[PDB]
Design a protein around this ligand. Structure first.
Ligand SMILES: *[C@H](C)[C@H]1/C(=C/c2[nH]c(/C=C3N=C(/C=C4\NC(=O)C(CC)=C4C)C(C)=C\3CCC(=O)O)c(CCC(=O)O)c2C)NC(=O)[C@@H]1C
Ligand SMILES: *[C@H](C)[C@H]1/C(=C/c2[nH]c(/C=C3N=C(/C=C4\NC(=O)C(CC)=C4C)C(C)=C\3CCC(=O)O)c(CCC(=O)O)c2C)NC(=O)[C@@H]1C
Ligand SMILES: *[C@H](C)[C@H]1/C(=C/c2[nH]c(/C=C3N=C(/C=C4\NC(=O)C(CC)=C4C)C(C)=C\3CCC(=O)O)c(CCC(=O)O)c2C)NC(=O)[C@@H]1C
Ligand SMILES: *[C@H](C)[C@H]1/C(=C/c2[nH]c(/C=C3N=C(/C=C4\NC(=O)C(CC)=C4C)C(C)=C\3CCC(=O)O)c(CCC(=O)O)c2C)NC(=O)[C@@H]1C
Ligand SMILES: *[C@H](C)[C@H]1/C(=C/c2[nH]c(/C=C3N=C(/C=C4\NC(=O)C(CC)=C4C)C(C)=C\3CCC(=O)O)c(CCC(=O)O)c2C)NC(=O)[C@@H]1C
Ligand SMILES: *[C@H](C)[C@H]1/C(=C/c2[nH]c(/C=C3N=C(/C=C4\NC(=O)C(CC)=C4C)C(C)=C\3CCC(=O)O)c(CCC(=O)O)c2C)NC(=O)[C@@H]1C
Ligand SMILES: *[C@H](C)[C@H]1/C(=C/c2[nH]c(/C=C3N=C(/C=C4\NC(=O)C(CC)=C4C)C(C)=C\3CCC(=O)O)c(CCC(=O)O)c2C)NC(=O)[C@@H]1C
Ligand SMILES: *[C@H](C)[C@H]1/C(=C/c2[nH]c(/C=C3N=C(/C=C4\NC(=O)C(CC)=C4C)C(C)=C\3CCC(=O)O)c(CCC(=O)O)c2C)NC(=O)[C@@H]1C
Ligand SMILES: *[C@H](C)[C@H]1/C(=C/c2[nH]c(/C=C3N=C(/C=C4\NC(=O)C(CC)=C4C)C(C)=C\3CCC(=O)O)c(CCC(=O)O)c2C)NC(=O)[C@@H]1C
Ligand SMILES: *[C@H](C)[C@H]1/C(=C/c2[nH]c(/C=C3N=C(/C=C4\NC(=O)C(CC)=C4C)C(C)=C\3CCC(=O)O)c(CCC(=O)O)c2C)NC(=O)[C@@H]1C
Ligand SMILES: *[C@H](C)[C@H]1/C(=C/c2[nH]c(/C=C3N=C(/C=C4\NC(=O)C(CC)=C4C)C(C)=C\3CCC(=O)O)c(CCC(=O)O)c2C)NC(=O)[C@@H]1C
Lengths: 73, 273, 162, 172, 162, 172, 172, 172, 162
């Protein structure tokens, strides 16, 4: 997701993170086995350095792995 | 307790009064020091409006003290209907959402995140809304922004206690009510060192949030239906935290921000700390 | 865009469930109505222009001062705009009749209505008269259900404007 | 949620029985009125804005103090709320009218309403008043429409009333 | 409970808006259909019993071994239950016809179907036959739209069971 | 989302014009077919379970490796997914069929599906195959009902096909 | 949470003292029984499904009304819940049995159970009954296993009972 | 009230049945013990004063602060209460012991007690402690009398314990 | 529930005093009697049925007209009830023997007896005969104190009924 402007209000250096998505990370609210969205198997988000460690750890424990990290600017 | 009649045979609005009983007020007909029955530490009476003044003065002139007064009509009302929260409904914000769908999410988010509480045109956040619908922000991320926003802080966090703010938070971010005294204690400590932003972050970041409505689903009420690792009492606490439809979390009302869940009730579900 | 058909699909889709009898019943309702709706649209489409002239005009009668110099109603550009605008309203209404939902109206006209109007100092009132005047004329060319439909949509805007 | 049909079902279910023929005939009849029923609703929705606007004016002409400093409709912020509330109640009422059942109105709207108003210090009396003012105006439209086939709507009109009144009562 | 009428209310309610033309169209659909639906229900309600006997029976023909001792089909209690159950299915179906939505079916029959069936080792298959046999009989007493409606609902269950 | 009607509107909008009379006549006739259209949909939904069940059996009889250890439909967990997916695709197709427009199908189902399948190592070819297997079975029902008024459904049948095929293609 | 060991600790703590030699010998002995203890648990878990299944059958044969329209176990959805609950209770009991302490059971399960049941309208007495039915069946297995070294499990058996009973009581 | 006999009855009643032969044999046996049972009670009542006196002394030797200004047993007035309470609990326990049932104890005495103590600021821990101190002393007498026919009272002794413990627990 | 043991507790409890010798003496009385009481219960429990048949029957002999059509004694439902009821009386009596007090009787049978009987037009008389007939039979299977006990309780009801 290309940042239109600095997403976060609170300010630090921001880094774009592209992740391969497990069904768990974004389960659809559907009956049966939850499916992540087809259109994005690789969600990309913008994160502040402070949040970067929590975001990565949560991504890690869920199936999906970091495809790439890029500084948001 | 339940009150069986709203009004006395002679017309007169009954009012339930709750006091802490004192040995003088009622005592066993026994030898030795007078003792009130332990079970009635908090006694309740329904009195007509006429005798209310006399009743209350007498209570107070003894060592009694009044816990609260409440009109009998509000009392002896049905427990709120759970119809709308038994099955929440749920909103998904697809990618390539058309204009209307994005609008629906937004509305739904404001509803759940703020309680019934009304958000005025000036209060509403264009910037955050802007981001959603040209991508860039997840529903999850919008939700974070709302809880960061001053609007949120002014209603929930700046008026009431941090004790109250926690459960207030639980309900908005997770349908659940809080289970156990520990959860309340953990959040309080988080807030003291990390501050307000970190605490808000810890509910959205939590896996319980992720497991249900993890991304791109507006939060819905999980409580009122059976959840994993949820104390049975939590379900009862959900009835205290959630009063009817068209009942809100309002700083505005007299003594607006108080605790729906008594501290003792939390202790029952679990103790340890 | 909100029409009957799109909605039931949406609802079905959200739950993740096949379209069952429930939804089809609804659909059946729409399309049954369509015959009347379609008729109404043919009628508006044809008389468009004349309706527009009449409306614009009306507005000026209702608010004479607009035509005075230094006002908004004054000088041709503005009149042209005024015409254009009402045309639009009409256009959309027809659309909505045919689509069988408010959808078209909501997305073109209604969403953002207020702010636009505020920033350019267009008084809702005006538009409203336009519409009302229209409604009155339409109340001759049409009749029965066709009419009823026409009204519904016209009103829908009145309420949104006000 | 609930409505006329579903309701009758549920009753029947607890008895454990197929629907009584008598009971069907309630529903059969109810269907026949549909068209009338619909138009009624249509009339409210079409006039919504106005209904409110009107009622408000009258409300404030009567209870001048609400709009005076120290009153409950002052200042702007409060006024706004008061208007919106009126509207909501109306919205629900309409819904009920279509359903053919009070429920939706009771559960979403009326339940807890009194207590809210109390906690805020909003004067329940005045609220109720407003609701009635609305009622009368609304009926006005329901009952006097234009381009509709002429016939008797009374039955519907009364049911409408009742809904308004349930509201008035439970708020008050 | 999900019926056409409840849904449109719900949708209207979510968006926070008055019922506009969109929804009424839908409602209208439900009401016009009702006449057929209602007819169907009268027909099923009357022949209930006979349908039930026939079904239960069928099942046994289809699965002879059930009636052998030490099986589930064996001994009257079980037969009684088997009857009871099918009655229910039927009962609900009628309800749904009248309510004009799957609602009644969903909440009584379908929700929790699987687990119940698993824990008591009721084989979906059985029920299904029952239904099918029924469907076949109904395919005589009814005709045209009334029939069509009856089918829809009957099937809806087949699919839920399977 | 979009559908036949909405679409035509949108086009007209960009031209800035009222709908052409010609264009109305598309929609006018589209309406007339409704009843047929509906029944078609009804037929799919009614037989859903079966359609799938059937297709699957055939899919696995053909590509035995999918169900062998090392294949993509093994073990149970995977198998389950594979079934689920088939169904979904079907569900969408139906939706489209009602709308009278591919869009819904393309946007909320097909788009990105190929790539997903690729990343997982699911063989897109086989998926496509399944979709066709489904197609044929489905048409089977659409085209051979009982107790419906007899007439020609071809027009609808073909459109159905196309939807299935768009699916097959974009996955493949 | 808590369990036999932890508990003894805590007691000791409030006295402010190192553990009594006597008290150690409680724990020392407790350890020795472990093996027995474990097998007991293993027996429950192994038979779980059946224990429930069984109990249910008997519960419904006795209290016919639960499964009649208007009863609490009707219709399916409700029935399902009732089964689910039984299981849960069992699950906990087992947990306790391993821990060697009631705690885990009552605070998580029984502290609000009665109140919930009340709000729902579920008849507490019947619930209790179910719990017992379960108890007996369960003990059945605990006490009669196969391929285990023969010896005396009574001690454990009784403690098991107690857990079941605490449940029964607090629900009731 | 309730007691062992009445209890069994009530159970039987809900089943709707005559008493089980098995169940009779509980009661039959219970009768046989009576004489023992009685003496037990007699022992407590006979020594009552002492039991308390004793326990108290020990309680205050341990928790010196209770009797210091600012503590909960100070001043006299409070002390008095504290003594009175201990006694009451004892009284009930005895009652139970005779009945052969906890109920009386739970319902009249224990119910609500914790919360009371809490509200007052009485330290529940200490209360519980006292109860135990009492327990031990009491057993002391029950178990070591003079001029009673020698035999085994264990069964009764343990039941006694339990009662004391229910008390300790619910207060704590 | 009123038994010897509960009462003395109650009395002790009211005064606020420990159980002293006075009460224990009383308790002792209850326990000594029990042996006889229990015996009696074993005897009634066993012959229950036969006692019931005999009684019901008797009543009809005593009041022939009851069995005529349009009366209460007529038609099986009623007979079934009649049986049921007497069973109950018996059941409770046994209970009371075992509990060693009237308690069980008072709370189940006696309290509300009058009004029930009035509202449903059950004539006490009937019950009474039932009991008497019973008493007579019991007067064979039992003897000595066991007998005496049985009587006491049986009578207690007679008096309550009358
Ligand atoms: C003594 C071991 C501990 C102690 C006791 C204590 N209790 C109170 C006050 C009350 N205690 C009770 C208890 C009962 N009331 C009942 O009716 C029953 C039996 C049915 C019980 C067991 C009650 C109700 C009171 C409060 C009112 C009253 O006086 O009756 C106190 C004094 C508290 C005060 O501030 O008044 C004390 C001290 N507390 C200790 O210090 C010991 C550890
Ligand atoms: C107007 C007729 C009268 C009036 C109303 C008034 N209401 C509020 C505040 C709230 N009222 C509600 C109402 C509802 N909540 C719901 O969800 C529904 C049904 C779904 C209703 C009708 C709520 C939620 C609030 C609280 C939130 C908020 O105030 O933002 C006020 C404002 C109270 C204040 O002191 O700010 C007022 C004024 N009061 C009058 O003066 C009229 C008699
Ligand atoms: C007619 C009653 C009066 C009038 C109208 C008038 N409008 C503008 C400017 C605008 N009007 C609109 C309206 C629309 N444009 C759209 O695209 C839509 C939705 C499809 C609507 C309803 C807008 C957006 C504008 C802003 C600029 C523009 O014209 O596009 C003016 C010009 C006012 C100015 O100073 O900007 C006027 C005068 N003219 C009259 O004579 C009446 C008083
Ligand atoms: C009653 C409050 C007033 C009134 C109403 C009225 N309406 C009809 C008949 C119809 N009205 C409609 C309207 C609709 N049907 C729909 O499906 C929709 C939503 C899409 C609407 C708005 C229709 C179609 C009919 C039938 C055709 C016709 O108009 O004749 C009647 C006649 C009674 C009847 O139809 O059985 C009446 C009385 N008219 C009054 O005089 C009341 C003040
Ligand atoms: C008939 C095809 C076969 C059969 C059936 C049978 N059913 C049961 C037990 C149950 N069946 C149901 C079904 C329902 N009850 C409901 O309330 C609803 C929803 C409205 C349904 C669909 C249920 C819930 C039960 C379980 C509880 C019960 O006691 O009924 C049995 C008995 C199984 C057992 O005793 O464990 C049987 C045999 N009987 C036959 O002969 C056919 C093979
Ligand atoms: C079945 C004919 C073939 C097959 C299917 C299969 N799919 C997966 C996994 C996924 N399939 C999808 C498809 C969708 N998810 C959606 O949300 C939608 C609608 C928008 C579709 C169509 C997705 C996203 C997944 C990934 C996550 C999931 O578990 O659903 C598998 C398992 C893949 C794996 O290795 O885990 C399978 C087997 N593959 C075959 O082998 C069949 C020929
Ligand atoms: C086409 C795939 C096959 C077929 C269809 C067919 N249907 C009709 C006519 C009707 N079909 C319906 C069905 C519905 N209308 C609704 O509102 C709903 C949802 C509630 C459905 C399912 C209706 C009502 C009609 C009108 C007359 C009737 O009672 O059938 C026809 C006849 C042509 C027409 O549209 O009038 C046909 C051909 N039958 C075939 O032969 C095809 C294989
Ligand atoms: C079955 C043996 C008996 C029975 C039970 C019963 N329970 C419900 C519904 C609920 N029970 C609970 C309780 C729990 N929540 C928990 O977390 C735990 C374990 C710690 C329990 C035991 C809850 C929360 C529900 C609500 C479930 C929901 O909302 O879906 C029912 C169904 C009633 C209903 O309307 O939900 C039943 C039947 N009652 C009987 O009839 C049996 C004797
Ligand atoms: C008790 C209900 C029945 C019973 C139990 C029993 N078990 C043993 C001995 C052992 N039990 C185990 C089992 C485990 N230990 C583990 O670590 C695990 C988990 C991996 C299990 C399941 C073990 C290892 C032993 C030791 C060897 C053996 O099996 O004998 C005994 C023997 C006495 C003792 O262990 O002290 C007994 C009696 N046997 C019965 O007959 C009871 C009904
Ligand atoms: C038990 C804690 C100790 C114990 C008891 C014990 N008692 C007996 C026997 C009797 N004790 C009594 C007591 C009473 N009967 C009454 O009616 C009353 C109240 C007025 C009392 C106080 C009686 C009468 C008997 C029977 C005759 C006798 O001489 O005791 C026994 C003997 C066994 C039995 O049940 O008969 C025993 C063992 N003895 C101990 O050593 C325990 C410490
Ligand atoms: C038998 C001597 C005659 C007789 C009896 C008869 N009884 C009833 C109805 C009731 N009898 C009772 C009695 C009891 N129910 C209880 O709960 C208890 C205490 C536990 C008793 C003793 C009650 C309460 C009823 C009313 C409820 C019911 O009827 O189920 C009837 C039915 C009369 C009626 O329905 O009007 C009859 C006929 N009939 C005979 O054959 C004898 C003359």
């Amino acid at each position: 997701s290309v940042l239109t402007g600095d997403n976060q209000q609170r300010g630090s250096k921001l880094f774009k993170i592209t992740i391969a998505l497990s069904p768990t990370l974004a389960h659809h609210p559907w009956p049966g086995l939850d499916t992540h969205e087809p259109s994005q198997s690789s969600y990309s988000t913008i994160v502040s350095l402070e949040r970067l460690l929590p975001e990565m750890t949560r991504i890690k424990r869920n199936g999906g792995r970091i495809l790439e990290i890029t500084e948001g600017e | 307790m339940n009150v069986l009649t709203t009004s006395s045979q002679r017309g007169g609005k009954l009012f339930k009064v709750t006091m802490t009983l004192s040995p003088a007020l009622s005592h066993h007909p026994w030898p030795s020091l007078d003792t009130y029955e332990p079970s009635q530490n908090s006694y309740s009476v329904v009195v007509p409006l006429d005798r209310l003044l006399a009743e209350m003065t007498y209570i107070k002139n003894k060592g009694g003290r009044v816990l609260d007064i409440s009109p009998a009509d509000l009392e002896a009302l049905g427990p709120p209907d759970i119809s709308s929260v038994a099955i929440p409904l749920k909103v998904e914000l697809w990618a390539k959402a058309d204009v209307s769908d994005v609008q629906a999410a937004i509305v739904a988010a404001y509803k759940q995140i703020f309680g019934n509480t009304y958000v005025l045109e000036s209060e509403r956040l264009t910037s955050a809304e802007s981001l959603l619908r040209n991508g860039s922000i997840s529903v999850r991320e919008f939700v974070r922004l709302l809880a960061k926003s001053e609007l949120y802080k002014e209603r929930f966090f700046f008026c009431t206690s941090n004790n109250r703010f926690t459960e207030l938070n639980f309900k908005h971010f997770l349908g659940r009510a809080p289970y156990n005294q520990s959860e309340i204690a953990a959040h309080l400590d988080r807030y003291q060192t990390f501050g307000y932003d970190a605490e808000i972050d810890s509910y959205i970041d939590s896996d319980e949030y992720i497991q249900a409505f993890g991304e791109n689903v507006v939060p819905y009420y999980r409580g009122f239906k059976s959840q994993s690792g949820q104390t049975v009492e939590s379900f009862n606490r959900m009835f205290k935290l959630y009063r009817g439809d068209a009942g809100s979390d309002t700083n505005l009302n007299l003594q607006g921000q108080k605790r729906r869940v008594d501290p003792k009730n939390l202790l029952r579900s679990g103790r340890g700390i | 865009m909100k029409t009957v058909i799109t909605e039931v699909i949406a609802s079905a889709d959200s739950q993740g469930r096949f379209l069952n009898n429930t939804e089809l019943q609804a659909a059946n309702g729409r399309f049954q109505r369509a015959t009347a709706s379609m008729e109404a649209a043919r009628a508006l489409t044809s008389n468009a222009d004349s309706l527009v002239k009449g409306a614009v005009q009306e507005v000026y009668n209702k608010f004479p001062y607009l035509t005075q110099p230094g006002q908004m109603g004054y000088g041709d550009t503005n009149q042209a705009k005024c015409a254009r605008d009402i045309s639009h309203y009409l256009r959309f209404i027809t659309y909505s009749l045919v689509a069988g939902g408010t959808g078209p109206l909501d997305d073109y006209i209604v969403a953002g209505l207020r702010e636009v109007n505020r920033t350019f100092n267009l008084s809702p009132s005006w538009y409203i008269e336009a519409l009302k005047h229209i409604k009155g004329k339409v109340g001759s060319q049409l009749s029965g259900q066709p009419l009823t439909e026409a009204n519904a949509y016209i009103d829908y805007c009145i309420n949104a404007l006000s | 949620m609930q409505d006329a049909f579903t309701k009758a079902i549920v009753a029947a279910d607890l008895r454990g029985s197929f629907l009584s023929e008598q009971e069907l005939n309630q529903l059969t009849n109810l269907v026949k009125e549909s068209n009338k029923r619909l138009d009624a609703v249509n009339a409210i929705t079409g006039n919504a804005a106005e209904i409110i606007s009107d009622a408000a004016h009258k409300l404030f002409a009567e209870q001048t103090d609400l709009i005076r400093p120290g009153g409950n409709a002052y200042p702007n912020r409060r006024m706004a709320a008061c208007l919106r509330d009126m509207e909501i109640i109306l919205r629900y009422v309409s819904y009920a009218l279509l359903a053919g059942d009070a429920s939706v109105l009771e559960d979403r709207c009326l339940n807890g309403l009194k207590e809210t108003y109390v906690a805020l210090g909003t004067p329940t009396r005045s609220v109720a008043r407003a609701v009635q003012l609305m009622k009368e105006t609304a009926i006005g439209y329901v009952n006097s429409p234009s381009g509709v086939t002429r016939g008797d709507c009374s039955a519907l009109v009364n049911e409408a009333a009742t809904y308004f009144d349930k509201a008035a009562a439970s708020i008050a």
